């Protein structure tokens, strides 16, 4: 399985912390991102290291690295992370607004809340109001006072994060989350369905549910062209993405409220 790390540009810049890494004994090669970095061989626990620790980076897939690229946050925007422990992708949409705007970050557990804040803490993330609440009641209080945001990360759990009857629950779960999310975006406004499963039942079936139980929404096409070196085509609906092995399983799709 392949190992990646994700450069913070909040904290470094790419070819520093490349040039640090190298000089320790660490093989880093080439991504079709200028911050993000395969690690061919370490000498170290890629999450050990003073670097790591600092905030200069984080490990994560590098298929885990495409939904925050394509939601595309903006400097300002006001965005919500539905599911967002342990923070890869939180702080990931945090170094692309630069610490600008707003990301609400929510996360059900108690538990994972814990490493969620340790991410952004360690990842030196200052634009992030972190939420413990399970989404589902947490939106009745966004709605009543119109929170509404400019763009949506709904990365959803999967069914890998843990069968027949695992698949379903997760799709369920995942149906729910999305309609949820549609109803907190601003008209014109952008979100990004993605989640660690490349079953068709966590994929196309969760967007094709979305497309039939609403009016309101649109299907945005992403391209599969611009993520170089990944084993990433289209969907079985046109303009979504399934990553497939060797890369992390992964499906990526983006909508649009009308
Ligand atoms: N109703 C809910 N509200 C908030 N978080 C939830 C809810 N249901 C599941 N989750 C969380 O969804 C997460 C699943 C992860 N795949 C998310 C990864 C995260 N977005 C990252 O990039 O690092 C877990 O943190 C679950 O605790």
Do not use: W
């Amino acid at each position: 399985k392949m190992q990646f790390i994700r450069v913070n540009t909040l904290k470094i810049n790419p070819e520093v912390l490349k040039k640090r890494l190298e000089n320790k004994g660490v093989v880093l090669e080439k991504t079709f991102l200028d911050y993000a970095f395969e690690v061919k061989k370490s000498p170290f626990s890629i999450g050990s290291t003073p670097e790591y620790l600092f905030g200069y980076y984080m490990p994560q897939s590098i298929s885990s690295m495409i939904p925050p690229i394509v939601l595309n946050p903006r400097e300002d925007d006001f965005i919500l992370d539905m599911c967002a422990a342990p923070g890869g992708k939180t702080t990931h949409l945090a170094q692309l607004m630069k610490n600008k705007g707003t990301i609400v970050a929510v996360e059900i557990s108690k538990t994972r809340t814990k490493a969620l804040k340790s991410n952004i803490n360690r990842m030196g993330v200052l634009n992030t109001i972190i939420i413990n609440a399970d989404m589902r009641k947490y939106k009745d209080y966004l709605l009543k006072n119109e929170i509404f945001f400019d763009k949506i990360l709904l990365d959803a759990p999967c069914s890998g994060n843990i069968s027949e009857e695992d698949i379903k629950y997760c799709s369920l779960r995942q149906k729910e989350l999305i309609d949820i999310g549609i109803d907190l975006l601003k008209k014109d406004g952008e979100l990004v369905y993605s989640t660690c499963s490349m079953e068709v039942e966590e994929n196309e079936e969760v967007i094709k549910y979305i497309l039939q139980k609403r009016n309101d929404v649109e299907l945005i096409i992403i391209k599969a062209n611009e993520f170089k070196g990944i084993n990433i085509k289209e969907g079985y609906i046109k303009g979504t993405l399934r990553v497939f092995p060797p890369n992390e399983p992964f499906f990526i799709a983006k909508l649009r409220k009308i």
